[PDB]
Write a protein that binds this DNA or RNA. Structure first.
Lengths: 197, 50, 50, 294
RNA sequence: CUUAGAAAAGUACAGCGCGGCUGAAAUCAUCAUUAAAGCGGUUCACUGCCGCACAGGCAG
């Protein structure tokens, strides 16, 4: 059975985008330093102009989640009056299930991503065929996209600041796998596991 | 179906009629008018006092 | 008017930007030459007054 | 002293700058930009992958429309200004203004920030009337970086001469057609003009498709940046304006000394520190044009 | 601390018949809106993988 604990960004003068990015960073770190990927991440509240003031971690295993929220970052921010932590609350039956899927489409929709796509096609052209001309490919005159937050991230193996984005959408209230990617994302390559508010 | 810039009919008439260079101290032609009005200089020649 | 500078005309006020809206007409790139055409007629209506 | 009606017409007439993309086959296609909107409009323009070099072309035409005022309420100030222009031309000459206006054409100042991270960019122009080969400048970044570097060109004296004749003789006219070649890095940012209203560019349809553009007025500002020449020394980035009316070196506080300047230009050798610079500023403002009514 | 002190106007009702505004017209000559203009990303959305994909998915 799912269990969750929540934390609220107490200061009013703060970028909750940056705070959520740091939270996802420590979450990913724990998901590697340890092999488990049980715990997902959910935002109880979401606004079209900014991510919510609270972030709630949802996991099928209680012990793993509690051990995760004992990480050094959380402890050293707790006594600084910048974080407020809830111990644990069982998932209510009245909660709703939505998925915070990460969107890889924007990384290709952007201009440098389009250039990367064309370069990848050029490299994959080693599969024998007539040499294509880049002049044929062109960018769309107009592009319309739904609301997203694009929290932000920095790679550790190499100094590349790739920015991750998540789009919220409702899904079927049942999925028993309880698996996620390196970060809680509800867009795991295997399946799009929902998370509760 | 496409709007296009034009030169007014009265404006082109004001162009081909710029032949008046008979005013008392004439240097350049003017538009033929009853009071020989200059436009580059505000004042008008061929005043009724003249 | 014909006097000392206005006191309220500080450095910022005289260097702010005032927008304007004008109609811009120009020859498109890749064209060859603009062509203009009109018609003018000469008649004998000056012989007798209207 | 200022008459109720006094207007001048610009002598320098820049045109729009149209960007072209050159492919390795040397075929040219108009540059295009993407527009992104959220459900606020943000516009992105980058060099497509595989493009050889960006090409920008525009035409600037000089004319002798500063000889006499376009409109003039009173005849006295008209002949005053005409005599002032004649005396300045005869005593100081158009060489300084011509060189300052021509350097911005040749050094790529009109490209604004588009030349920030380009490896090398060339400026080649075909003047008119002309009787020989096109004037060509190669690798402005390293070769032509100073007045001496420009003057050491093969025919720098010839091109600057036709501007002097155009400014001096009535009906005189010189037309240039500039063509820049920018070897920008792969998928480098191109910064065109943004329309008055977020980031949204000015656009004109070329060959049936929209293209980013640099405004004609915006290019004129870069060509006329010789001091930007104006009634007051307005600075765009830092809000404050130099040549404030209190400083006594604006256009009007200098224009109203026309009789003194006429006396000075004809009496003895003018000082190169104060009077010559004031004369340069006055004629630079006259070339720009405008209305000096009140 | 009021020309103070007090007071139910109410019952019925058919305006009806008929009608030709018609003849005529010329609004009508002339006209220059012209001059002059920077709206500005310093970084920020990168680089790999799969798939034949101007398809759509992966990770750091």
């Amino acid at each position: 059975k799912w269990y969750y604990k929540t934390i609220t960004f107490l200061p009013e003068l703060c970028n909750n985008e940056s705070l959520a990015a740091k939270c996802l960073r420590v979450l990913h770190g724990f998901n590697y330093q340890y092999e488990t990927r049980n715990i997902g991440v959910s935002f109880p509240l979401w606004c079209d102009a900014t991510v919510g003031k609270k972030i709630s971690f949802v996991s099928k295993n209680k012990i793993e989640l509690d051990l995760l929220l004992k990480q050094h970052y959380f402890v050293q921010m707790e006594q600084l009056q910048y974080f407020h932590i809830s111990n644990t609350v069982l998932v209510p039956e009245d909660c709703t299930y939505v998925s915070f899927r990460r969107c890889q489409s924007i990384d290709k929709l952007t201009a440098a991503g389009l250039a990367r796509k064309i370069r990848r096609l050029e490299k994959r052209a080693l599969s024998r065929g007539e040499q294509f001309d880049p002049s044929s490919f062109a960018q769309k005159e107009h592009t319309a996209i739904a609301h997203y937050h694009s929290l932000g991230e920095s790679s550790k193996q190499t100094n590349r600041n790739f920015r991750l984005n998540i789009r919220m959408l409702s899904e079927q209230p049942r999925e028993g796998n309880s698996i996620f990617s390196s970060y809680g994302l509800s867009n795991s390559e295997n399946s799009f596991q929902p998370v509760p508010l | 179906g496409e709007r296009s810039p034009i030169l007014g009919a009265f404006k082109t008439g004001a162009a081909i009629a710029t032949i008046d260079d008979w005013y008392p101290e004439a240097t350049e032609p003017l538009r033929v008018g009853r009071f020989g009005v200059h436009r580059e200089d505000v004042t008008c020649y061929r005043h009724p006092s003249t | 008017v014909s006097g000392q500078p206005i006191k309220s005309a500080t450095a910022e006020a005289l260097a702010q930007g005032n927008p304007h809206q004008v109609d811009f007409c120009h020859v498109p790139y890749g064209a060859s030459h603009i062509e203009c055409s009109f018609s003018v007629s000469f008649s004998s209506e000056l012989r007798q007054p209207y | 002293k200022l008459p109720t009606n006094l207007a001048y017409e610009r002598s320098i007439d820049p045109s729009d700058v149209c960007f072209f993309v050159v492919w390795p086959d040397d075929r040219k296609t108009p540059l295009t930009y993407n527009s992104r909107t959220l459900l606020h409009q943000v516009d992105f323009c980058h060099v497509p992958y595989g493009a050889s070099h960006i090409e920008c072309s525009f035409s600037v035409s000089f004319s002798s429309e500063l000889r006499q005022p376009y409109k003039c309420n009173s005849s006295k100030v008209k002949q005053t200004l005409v005599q002032l222009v004649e005396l300045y031309e005869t005593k100081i000459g158009w060489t300084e203004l011509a060189t300052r206006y021509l350097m911005n054409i040749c050094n790529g100042k009109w490209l604004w920030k588009n030349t920030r991270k380009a490896y090398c960019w060339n400026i080649v122009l075909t003047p008119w009337p002309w009787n020989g080969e096109k004037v060509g400048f190669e690798d402005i970044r390293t070769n032509y970086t100073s007045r001496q570097d420009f003057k050491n060109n093969k025919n720098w004296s010839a091109i600057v001469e036709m501007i002097k004749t155009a400014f001096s003789s009535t009906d005189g006219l010189a037309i240039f057609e500039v063509r820049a070649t920018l070897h920008l890095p792969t998928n480098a940012m191109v910064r065109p003009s943004q329309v008055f209203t977020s980031r949204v560019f000015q656009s004109t349809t070329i060959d049936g498709e929209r293209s980013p553009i640099l405004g004609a007025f915006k290019t004129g500002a870069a060509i006329a940046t010789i001091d930007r020449v104006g009634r007051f020394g307005v600075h765009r980035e830092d809000v404050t304006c130099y040549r404030h009316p209190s400083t006594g070196k604006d256009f009007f506080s200098i224009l109203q000394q026309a009789e003194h300047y006429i006396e000075v230009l004809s009496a003895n050798k003018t000082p190169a520190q104060e009077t010559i610079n004031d004369m340069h500023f006055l004629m630079a403002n006259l070339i720009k044009g405008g209305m000096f009514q009140h």
